[model samples]
Target: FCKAQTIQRRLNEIEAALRELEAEGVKLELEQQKKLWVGQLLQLVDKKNSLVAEEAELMITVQELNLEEKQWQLDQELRGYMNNLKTAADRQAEDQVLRKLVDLVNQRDALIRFQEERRLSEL
Candidate 1:
């Protein structure tokens, strides 16, 4: 979660920096600062590419996490139904399974909140 938040913060910073560079590049060009303009524009392009790659990576992570969360949810549901048929040792196993399922649920919920924070940051 902290890693995701850090990535999101860096992504936001990169975007803002790119926008600033672009705006400044135009200003420099209009003011006849050719060398400065070229330098800033190049940096802007590099940052744009970086942003694209980072966003792609983040998308992949998000998709994978989403799939995992869904699978965990299904597992939880199935386990819940089967839990009823458990005996002595079987009940112990089911208890462990339920504990792990709850942990997964917590992790999934954290990721969901992280995603929501990212969305809100975008807004």
Candidate 2:
């Protein structure tokens, strides 16, 4: 089909251009090209645009995760005051606080594991 032939030619063109970049400066050019493709593919394929919900979930890059680490840290502090509910003797009030605290700690624990692995290997 014409569509298949078009795709084949486009792929060859892409490969040829990549070869040129490899000759010019493999590391830097490849990085930029990869970033470009990622943006293009995500924008084209995701109907809702991945930069929203699904994309947020997919963010596991060190940079992204570290940002989230700080976000979760600060939120935990806000929820820290929720401990006040413990003395109120209202089961429902404590339920909400405890629920969130448990979830927050779980996220933090996993994040710590990630950070330690990075530090351990680097050491």
Candidate 3:
């Protein structure tokens, strides 16, 4: 549950949902469709909060070890996940991959900022 493996799994799940939303969101409108939009939006937010919770679990592992590196983009879990995305390009969905990358990094940055706040910074 706390291994780097779980962290990578998080990225895959998050990326898949992003694609699902992009696929389903191939619709838009108001009033009549707004109810549909509201439902989807609620699901999206729920997923995001779920992601944050899972992130905290992974970060607990990260915190205990105090990895040799602090730049999360280079983290093994993230680096491998991001590199994996390169071999499977959706072409048009590249933007969403970028979205996934940024979102994960944001989670990492925010974790470290809070982690560092409670400790001394180094590397």
Cα RMSD, each candidate: 9.8, 17.0, 16.7
Ranking by TM-score: 1, 3, 2
- Candidate 3 per-residue C-alpha lDDT over 46-100 given as tens digits, one digit per residue, 9 for 90 to 100: 7666665556656665653443334343444444554544645544355555566
Compose the digit string of candidate 1's lDDT tens values, residues 1-123.
334556667667767877876786677656467676667777767767777657756765666566576776668765664744456876776667678767766776766776676668657
Order of all candidates by lDDT, from best down to worst? 1, 3, 2
Cα error, candidate 3, residue 83 (Å): 44
lDDT of 2 by residue, 3-34 (tens): 32344454455556546544544243347877
- lDDT score at residue 51, model 1, on the 0-100 scale: 76
Candidate 1 lowest-lDDT run of ten: 1-10
- For each candidate in turn, the TM-score is 0.48, 0.30, 0.35
Number of the predicted model whose TM-score against the real structure is largest: 1
Q: Tally clashing residue pairs in candidate 2.
A: 0
